[PDB]
Amino acid sequence: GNRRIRSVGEMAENQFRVGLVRVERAVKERLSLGDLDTLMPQDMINAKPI
């Protein structure tokens, strides 16, 4: 009753979650200096990290 079973689906979600927080820090970093209309939600979010 105290041993819980995870399995692939949940596990991928957890790693992916970590991927999203480490992108979050970056995202804030860009919104720090931001110009209004030049950038869009691409120039910020990277791929490789996730």
Q: Encoding tokens for residue 22?
A: 């480490």
How far apart CA 11 and CA 41 sit, in angstroms, is 27
CB of 49 to other proteins, least distance (A): 8
29 binds other proteins (CB under 8 A): no
25: contact with other proteins by CB under 8 A? no
SS3 6: coil
CA quadruple 32, 35, 36, 38: dihedral sign: negative
Nearest to other proteins of 7, 32 (CB atom): 7
Q: Which residues bind other proteins (CB under 8 A)?
A: 3-8, 11-12, 16, 19, 23, 36-37, 40-43, 45-48, 50
